Every structure is written in structure tokens, then in C-alpha cells.
Design a protein around this ligand. Structure first.
Ligand SMILES: O=C(C[C@]12C[C@H]3C[C@H](C[C@H](C3)C1)C2)Nc1cccc2nc(NCCNCCO)ccc12
Ligand SMILES: O=C(C[C@]12C[C@H]3C[C@H](C[C@H](C3)C1)C2)Nc1cccc2nc(NCCNCCO)ccc12
Ligand SMILES: O=C(C[C@]12C[C@H]3C[C@H](C[C@H](C3)C1)C2)Nc1cccc2nc(NCCNCCO)ccc12
Ligand SMILES: *[C@@H]1O[C@H](CO)[C@@H](O[C@@H]2O[C@H](CO)[C@@H](O)[C@H](O)[C@H]2NC(C)=O)[C@H](O)[C@H]1NC(C)=O
Ligand SMILES: *[C@@H]1O[C@H](CO)[C@@H](O[C@@H]2O[C@H](CO)[C@@H](O)[C@H](O)[C@H]2NC(C)=O)[C@H](O)[C@H]1NC(C)=O
Ligand SMILES: *[C@@H]1O[C@H](CO)[C@@H](O[C@@H]2O[C@H](CO)[C@@H](O)[C@H](O)[C@H]2NC(C)=O)[C@H](O)[C@H]1NC(C)=O
Ligand SMILES: *[C@@H]1O[C@H](CO)[C@@H](O)[C@H](O)[C@H]1NC(C)=O
Ligand SMILES: *[C@@H]1O[C@H](CO)[C@@H](O)[C@H](O)[C@H]1NC(C)=O
Ligand SMILES: *[C@@H]1O[C@H](CO)[C@@H](O)[C@H](O)[C@H]1NC(C)=O
Ligand SMILES: *[C@@H]1O[C@H](CO)[C@@H](O)[C@H](O)[C@H]1NC(C)=O
Ligand SMILES: *[C@@H]1O[C@H](CO)[C@@H](O)[C@H](O)[C@H]1NC(C)=O
Ligand SMILES: *[C@@H]1O[C@H](CO)[C@@H](O)[C@H](O)[C@H]1NC(C)=O
Lengths: 321, 321, 321
């Protein structure tokens, strides 16, 4: 009957369109990115109630490190606390660190917010305000918001160049993201330059619809996705990437969940024969490059299995009517 | 017959239970962990036969660096050799470095255990013991065991917070390890808090049944596994992680296989207009976060293929009896 | 007929050979590599038209850092620019930086090749040659080729030891690259020692057919592949790795595509109460360890599905003749 040529046709259609005849191999990627662009910074930051002038120019080595583990990071803001040395000092005044008397402090106590071990003594921090005394690197860094203008706010104007090599082992097929002979001088655009590997970070943040400056103040984790729908047949060959952009960070905005991206970097030195340390809280956006792909190539055994599940249907449609 | 409704029922059962109707997509994860906790260290370490007092407090910046490549490391013990400068010095006495005369040493020789190039001269190291003379950073670090108490033995009391975002692209489904609104203040427990992302390192080492201190002396590689069995149907929806713990390091305990986790960190400075270097052998536990998942969502073509292989069986069971 | 026992036999053959009866699970790997070997460097490098003598010995800490993200790097060449401080200086003379008059320079201009922000002034750089004045770390590094002999040319003689642990979760099977009791003292050979994990970098570069020195001058990205075809049956059990070597870098050799592997490392210090910086351009080869595997174990449901697509064929071959 007609419903049978229609069943055959629906099966074969699902084969040809859903690519059931092809064998699919997982993709293998290695990433090499180079960042370009510099930022000039003139800003006034308050340290310990005293105005200080942070000025200067930041180049590649000043704000970034080469990617490792398919992810690179760019510092967009920072807080610097200098001159720390091992000693005893009162903790920074917080809801949990203020003491009325020595009875309020407990010797040897450790608190998740604090950075030192208490000595069980109540001492003044400033004027008549009293905090608990601790043993740590002194003085203790301020509990302060990241500067209201992100010191490296120019970070949206930076340029990231992404090189991606992909290899399918089952089919012995190697290709790279940048095809030979292309005009390298371009800026990636969703339509105008969908294969251009030159990305602007601000463009990236507009794609996902999040403001760059806001994330740049306190940090975040952004992700770049590279898709490969690759066909290794010849009768319909195609194998290029599709760039998409997703914001990965949670954006909880709760003190308990350590929001944004930041980490503590330590630089050690010696003055007057004393072990000393400058502590730098680093704020920035970490970019994670995720590359995924599927390689299809005509396989005879798969066609055999597919018509295998197809023929039983083909006659069952006869038993049905 | 009855065996036929039983064959139909066994096939359909394997479908409903082994989830044959669903399409399975691979999981995509990015990891962001924050470490919390500090350690106070008072210990006596022998350098060159002289007792020295290692004291002080170690905070986040002092023992760890932000994770990259889905793995973070925590230093648990260390050996420090200070004041090195380019020069000529006798190698540290070993089974392979002791020399009776200049004939025993070979100029320009390189040995896997040694850290310098020999000059072919036999010279005294201490008293009448003689070793081969080498060209390297001097003095050469001691061949010494890591301190019998791990200097940062408090490391089991530390807290690691793990944030995991997972995304299935074929189904356009994004979720994160921490569901919104949960009580963040908890410590992970195999039963009491199986979804709590706050982990204690000592608890981790008890799960895999290995003592934390022993690994902390000379280092090791520990691994955290995060499973996602995710169902994107609705008729039986569920998609949460299962935390499991495996000890990854080999634990060979053979000098040839460089057991444990350690690496050589170099800090450079200048004194009296001389290039100089302090070398620090770092011992610690590296934690590797491995995240895997499968996303199932009802697929009509798969049901078609499955009943496709099912019907042939269904009649063959008739031909059999 | 005979063509039918032949169809049955072809189907069952494809089953037994293409391993259709087995269930395949993806492999999970963590990598731990230790690098061994040192290099002695005596070379004459020209800085600012003045000959300078770079001598000294480089050990593990001097040229490498422990791997993170399944990739380790080894510096093979370097360029060092010392004494930089924040200030105003003329840019290094280039095709884009030479100025005839102040009209040629534009204040506040930024150029991808330059490392500073222009001040719109034309000033002399050397003799009567004039470049545009910029605001940056001064002096600006030379536009110079990497030293004609790679300073760390000895890098091909280095030894990398690779430890790989693989685990299949669906089958609960854990194994490691190094089986217990093997003779560790060996050098990997394609035939003589195909399971030896001790690799020589020069051997690696000969496998892929690229000269080590050439890549060592300006850097590159090399990749080590570890295959696991693992059978968890018993009736034909086998599960060991196959080491293969592929050169991953593009080798474009175009200034626009930033060829080779290099990055900018910054070291900060203070002299006469002035913020200062030494900038080091690092050239080296990054090795990316890619591990892939498939674990097969006899599965009854898969045999059921396979004969499911098989029987329909088995009778259709009867309808055909
Ligand atoms: O610490 C770094 C290097 C990196 C940055 C990220 C994070 C971490 C790994 C990697 C990526 C390298 C450290 N950069 C800096 C941080 C904070 C302040 C800095 N100030 C500078 N000079 C300005 C002086 N003004 C006087 C002028 O009159 C220069 C560099 C700075
Ligand atoms: O080197 C580091 C930083 C890290 C540690 C790991 C490994 C590596 C990358 C990243 C993670 C940062 C280096 N920390 C240290 C190592 C060894 C000794 C140290 N001693 C310290 N002061 C004690 C002085 N006592 C005098 C008191 O009277 C402070 C820090 C120390
Ligand atoms: O900077 C590093 C450390 C690493 C190297 C790579 C890249 C980066 C991360 C990690 C891997 C550590 C930095 N090493 C060096 C670089 C350049 C020059 C050096 N010169 C040295 N002394 C020679 C003096 N001659 C006077 C004798 O009369 C010693 C070390 C040097
Ligand atoms: C990134 O660069 C753009 C242009 O290069 C900056 O936009 C310019 O802003 C200045 C004032 O600061 C204006 O005089 C220009 O006319 C603007 N140009 C354009 C094309 O709009 C932008 O400010 C830079 N980003 C940051 C954070 O400074
Ligand atoms: C980790 O912390 C626990 C408790 O916070 C420590 O156990 C305590 O040990 C001290 C003596 O050192 C005792 O006075 C306490 O009563 C103990 N408390 C508990 C709850 O057992 C433990 O010693 C710490 N780990 C390390 C390595 O110091
Ligand atoms: C790597 O090591 C080999 C041997 O260890 C070096 O080859 C030697 O070169 C010297 C001269 O430089 C000769 O005297 C030896 O006879 C050579 N030995 C062999 C076995 O050929 C090689 O030069 C080293 N690589 C580099 C870059 O120096
Ligand atoms: C992959 O294909 C190329 C085609 O030129 C061939 O030269 C190469 O040997 C193949 N590799 C393998 C492992 O078969
Ligand atoms: C690349 O395209 C731009 C226009 O977008 C053009 O100005 C430039 O000359 C092109 N490059 C080459 C090498 O043709
Ligand atoms: C994914 O689903 C959400 C549901 O609200 C939708 O808004 C979004 O556009 C979808 N994404 C794609 C790529 O279809
Ligand atoms: C979380 O649970 C603890 C008890 O385990 C409780 O004391 C605490 O108040 C809870 N947090 C919130 C916000 O309810
Ligand atoms: C894996 O197999 C071993 C075999 O001895 C067994 O001890 C272990 O409990 C198994 N693990 C799981 C999760 O079943
Ligand atoms: C390993 O093999 C070498 C020969 O290639 C031999 O000299 C050495 O003794 C062997 N090691 C052991 C422990 O037998």
C-alpha cells in the first residue's frame, strides 16, 4: 500500500537527515590563545582612611598569564596591601571581631572570615573601638569593596586570539580552527565574521547580555563555546566551528558563597633582615574555552543495523493495516 | 502464547529501566573552588646539621593558588634551601657521588640524581669525606626526608568549597551544583549532607581510607568525583550530583618512580650585585576534580529503533516454540 | 540456502570483530609527569648593540613548572629586558613607529604592536632616527629574533616521566599506565619499549618528523597521545596504552598569527624607592597530554539489540533470493 512506501520513506528520511548512516567520533582539542591590548590606569584608592594615587600602565605581563587547562584569566581590578610581616595585631573590625573585654576573645580561636589565630586578648584598633588580637601577617587587609571604578576597566577593549586544533583519531582527520589563507585582520561578529577568531571581550559580554564593567569590579567566570558539526563524507562535506557565548559564574551575590572571581597572591621580600610579604587581592574575569564536536563518516555496518531495525517495522506496518 | 507477552514485557522492561527511550548527551562542566582555613606552624628543622626554628602562620596565599585545569593544590610540607648562587661546589654525598680520587670523577658528566655538571675533580665535602665537584647553583640542597611531622599537618582541617556548572547543549539545559536557596552552612557527609559542597580534606581522606598525615608528609594526588545521572523528561525528572572519593596517586614508594607529589619552586634575588636564588622543594596534595554526567530526554527516533530490534525478536520467539 | 548461513556468519562476524556484544565506556584520566635533566648555557647575546655574556646552569626549577590541566611546559629559549620602570620613552623603531615630525604622532594612540600609549610627540631614539613617544614601562624591549642558537638547546636530551591513571566508572575498573614490577630504567622506543613511560624529547620530535632545535628557537606546542583499547571480558582481555606523537602547533610563520610559543613574564622589584620591573620573554615547547580510551565488557542487552537488527536481515535475505 501507500502507507508502506511512506514508512520506508520516513525511515530513510530519518536516516539521511538525522545522519544515521554516519559513524560519529568524539572531538579532541588543544587550545592556544594570545591576548593583546594594554590599559592605562589613573585612580584614587583609599588605604586606611588615606587617599593614595594608583597610576601607571598595564601591559600583557602585568595583567595576564598564558592559559593552562583550556582557560586564561585577565585581571580587571585589584586591592593591594603592602608591608605585612609575621606578628601580633588586632583583627580588622567586623561584626564578628569586635570585643568589649578580654572575656569576649578566646585564645587559639579560628574564624572563617578571619585570617589569623586569636590570642584571647581584647585590644584597641582605632580610637576606642576594640577588636580581638590575633597572630598572623600584620597589618590585616581591609574589608573593603573593590574600587567603584574597576581599575582595569579598559578590559572590554582587549583582544583575544584563539587557536584551536581538532583531531579525530578513528577517521585520522586533523584540522584547525583557522583555515589557511584567511584575512586575519577582523573582529569577530555573530554575522559579519562568524569564523573570525579575533574576539573583543566587551562584544563577548554583550552577547551574553551582561555588562562588562559590573563583572570587572568583583570578577566573574565567562565561557567561550566552540561547536564542530563535522561531516567526513564528501557527498555533503562540512567542518567548521560555531562560536557561542555563555556566562558561567553563578552571580549569587551572597557573602557566604564567595561571589565573583578573586584570589590572594603573595609576594615575599626581606627588609632589615625581617621576613616580609606584600599581599594582593586579585579580581578579574576567567575565560574557559569549551570545545566540543562530532565527526560523522559513512559506515556500512551502521547502515546494516539501521535497515535492521527498519525492515521489521516495514512489515509490521503491513500487519497493522 | 504467554512467553510472548513475557518477551514483549521483558523488552519493554529493559526499555523503561535501562532508559532505552531516552537520548543521552554528554555533560560539560566548569569548576570554581575556593579554599578556606589557615595553619599555624611551630617546628624545628635541621639544616646542615644545625637546628633551625620554622615558625609562623600560613594563610590562603601562603599555601595555595587558584585552580586551573580543574585541579587545585595545597602545600602540606616543604623544604627550603636559601642563598644559592651560580658556582662550583662538591655534590651532596650519595651512593653515586662519593669519590676516592680525581679518577673517580668524570668532567662534564651528568647524573639523573645530581643537579649539576661535574668538573672531574674529587674534593672534600665534610671532614675527610670526598664527593665529586660540580658546576651548579651552590650549595646543593640536602638529600633529606620531608620533616617527620608535616609542617602544615593542620591541612586536614581545611575547607574546600566546590562550585560546578553543568550544561547539555543538545537539550539546551543548564544547571549548577548548588541549587538556589540551600543552607550553605554545612559540612559534607556521605549521608547527612550528600549535596553539601563544603568538604573537609580529612573527611575526604577518611572516605578513601588513607591517612591524611602520611600523604601530607611527602605529597600525593587525591581526586574528587562528581556524578550526574540526569533525566530531562518530566515524567521522572531528577538531576543532582553524587560525590565520590578516590585516591589517585600510585603509592609505589620506590626512589626510581619519584613517589608522592613534590616540585621545585625557584625565587630569584640579587645580593652585592650577584645573581642569587632561593630554592624551595614543595610537598603537598593535588586535588583533581573529575565531573561526568549523562543527560537523558525522551526521543521518538530511539523508540522507533528500539521497537525495531524488538519486533523481530517478538516473532522469532513464536518461531522458536 | 547457503547465502543464509553466510548472512548469519557475516552478521555474527561483525559482532565478534567489531565488538558489538560489548558495552563501551569512556575513559577517565589524571596525569602526573616529572621532568628530569639539566642544561648548561654559555652564549653571547647582543643587548642594545652591546655584547653580553649569558652563562650558567639551568635545573628543574629554572626552566619548568609542574603540569596543570594535563599539560607541562619547558622553556627552551628566552630574551631578558631588565630595569624597566614607569615612564615616558620613545617607542622601539619599527615600520609603524618612525616619525618625521610631531604631526606623525597622535596623542593617546594605541597600536597592537606597541606596548605603550603615545603622547603625540616625535623624539629621537638613536642618532637622527626618530620614533613616537609613549607612556609605558621603559625602556621598551627590543624587537629582536630569539637567539640563533636556542639558549636551552640541550632540551632534546631531557627526560619526561608520565604517570597516567585510568578508571572506568560503569564497570568499576581502575588501572594505571605503569603496571607493577616493570623495569623502570628504559627509554621509550616505538618498538623496543612501547610501554616504557620514560620519554626523550628529541625522540618525540623525531617521531613527528620535526627538528627539535628549530621549534626550540621560537617555541611550539607538541602533543603526546595515549590510547587505551581495553577489553574487560576475560575471554580476550587486554588493556594497555599505545603512545603516539603529533605536532600540534600551526607553524604559520606569519607575524600576524603570533607563531610559536612565547609569553611575557614579569618580575617586580624596588630600587631607590622606585617601582621597577624586569620583563622576560619566554620561548619554549608546551607538551599537551591527551588520553583517550574505550572500555568494552560483554553486555546481554546489547547482544539482544544486535541480533534484533540481525534477524530481520536474516529473513529478508530469504525474501530476496
Ligand atoms: O601582579 C601583577 C601580575 C599578575 C597579574 C594577574 C594575576 C597574577 C598572575 C598574572 C595575572 C600576573 C599577578 N600586576 C599588578 C597587580 C597590582 C598592581 C600592579 N601595579 C603595577 N604598577 C603600577 C605602579 N604605579 C606607579 C606609577 O607611578 C604593575 C603591575 C601590578
Ligand atoms: O612559597 C609559598 C607560596 C606558594 C605555596 C604553594 C606552592 C607555590 C605556589 C603557591 C602554593 C604559593 C608557592 N609559601 C611558603 C613556602 C615555604 C615557607 C614559607 N614561609 C613563610 N613564612 C614563615 C617565616 N617564619 C618566620 C616567622 O618568625 C611563608 C610562606 C612560605
Ligand atoms: O625565569 C625562570 C623560571 C621559569 C622558567 C619557565 C617559565 C617561567 C615559569 C617556570 C618555567 C619558571 C619562569 N628561569 C630563567 C629565565 C631567564 C634567565 C635565567 N637565568 C638564570 N641564571 C643565569 C645567570 N647567569 C649568570 C651566571 O654567571 C636562571 C634562571 C633564568
Ligand atoms: C574602549 O575604546 C573606545 C574607543 O576606542 C572608547 O570609546 C571612546 O571614548 C572616548 C572617551 O573616553 C571618546 O573620546 C571616543 O570618541 C570613544 N570612541 C568610540 C568609538 O566610542 C572606550 O571608552 C574604551 N573603553 C574604556 C573602558 O575606556
Ligand atoms: C583539627 O581540629 C581539631 C578540632 O578543631 C583538632 O582536635 C583538637 O585537638 C586539640 C589538641 O591539639 C584538643 O584540645 C581538642 O579537644 C581537639 N578537638 C576535637 C574536636 O577533637 C585537631 O588536632 C586539628 N588537627 C590538627 C592536625 O591539628
Ligand atoms: C645530547 O647528548 C648527546 C650525548 O649525550 C650529545 O651528543 C654528544 O655531543 C658531544 C659534543 O657536543 C660529543 O662529544 C659526543 O660524542 C656526543 N654523543 C653522542 C652519543 O652522540 C648531544 O650534543 C646533546 N645535545 C645537545 C643539544 O647538546
Ligand atoms: C592519515 O592519513 C594520511 C593521508 O595522507 C596518511 O599519510 C597517514 O599515514 C594516515 N595516518 C594513519 C595513522 O594511518
Ligand atoms: C582584510 O580586510 C580588510 C577590510 O575588512 C582590508 O582592509 C584588508 O586589506 C584585508 N587584508 C588583506 C590581506 O587583504
Ligand atoms: C534555551 O531555552 C530557553 C528557555 O527559556 C530559551 O530562552 C533559549 O532561547 C534556548 N536557547 C536556544 C539556543 O534555543
Ligand atoms: C543551617 O543549618 C544550621 C543547622 O545545621 C542552622 O544552625 C542554621 O541556622 C541554618 N541556616 C539558616 C540560614 O537557616
Ligand atoms: C569495585 O570492585 C571491587 C572489587 O574488589 C570492590 O571491592 C568494590 O567495592 C567495587 N566498588 C563498587 C563501587 O562497587
Ligand atoms: C633493566 O634493564 C637493563 C637493561 O636494559 C638492566 O641493565 C637493568 O639491570 C634492569 N633492571 C633491573 C632492576 O633488572
Amino acid at each position: 500500500w501507500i502507507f508502506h512506501a511512506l514508512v520506508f520513506s520516513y525511515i530513510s528520511f530519518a536516516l539521511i537527515s538525522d545522519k544515521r548512516y554516519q559513524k560519529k567520533e568524539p572531538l579532541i582539542s588543544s587550545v592556544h590563545t594570545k591576548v593583546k591590548g594594554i590599559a592605562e590606569v589613573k585612580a584614587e584608592i583609599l588605604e586606611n582612611g588615606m587617599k593614595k594615587m594608583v597610576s601607571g600602565v598595564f601591559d600583557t605581563a602585568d595583567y595576564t598569564f598564558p592559559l593552562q587547562g583550556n582557560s586564561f584569566f585577565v585581571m580587571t581590578n585589584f586591592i593591594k596591601t603592602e608591608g605585612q610581616q609575621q606578628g601580633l595585631c588586632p583583627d580588622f573590625p567586623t561584626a564578628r571581631t569586635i570585643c568589649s573585654s578580654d572575656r569576649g576573645c578566646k585564645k587559639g580561636r579560628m574564624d572563617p572570615q578571619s585570617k589569623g589565630i586569636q590570642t584571647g586578648r581584647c585590644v584597641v584598633y582605632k580610637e576606642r573601638l576594640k577588636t580581638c588580637e590575633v597572630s598572623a601577617w600584620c597589618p590585616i587587609e581591609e574589608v573593603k569593596d573593590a574600587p567603584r571604578p574597576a581599575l582595569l576597566n579598559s578590559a572590554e577593549n582587549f583582544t583575544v586570539l584563539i587557536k584551536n586544533n581538532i583531531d579525530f583519531p578513528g577517521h585520522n582527520y586533523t584540522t584547525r580552527n583557522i583555515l589557511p589563507g584567511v584575512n586575519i585582520t577582523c573582529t569577530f561578529h555573530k554575522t559579519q565574521n562568524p569564523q573570525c577568531p579575533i574576539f573583543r571581550l566587551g562584544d563577548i559580554f554583550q552577547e551574553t547580555g551582561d555588562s562588562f564593567s559590573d563583572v570587572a569590579i568583583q570578577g566573574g567566570i565567562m565561557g567561550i563555546e566552540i561547536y564542530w558539526d563535522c561531516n567526513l563524507d564528501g557527498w555533503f562535506h562540512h567542518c567548521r566551528p560555531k562560536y557561542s557565548f555563555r556566562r558561567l559564574d553563578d552571580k549569587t551575590t551572597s557573602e557566604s558563597l564567595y561571589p565573583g572571581y578573586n584570589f590572594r597572591y603573595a609576594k615575599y621580600y626581606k627588609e632589615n633582615n625581617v621576613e616580609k610579604r606584600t599581599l594582593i587581592k586579585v579580581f578579574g574575569i576567567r575565560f574557559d574555552i569549551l570545545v566540543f564536536g562530532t565527526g560523522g563518516k559513512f559506515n556500512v555496518i551502521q547502515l546494516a543495523v539501521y535497515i535492521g531495525s527498519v525492515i521489521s517495522y516495514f512489515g509490521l506496518a503491513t500487519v497493522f493495516i
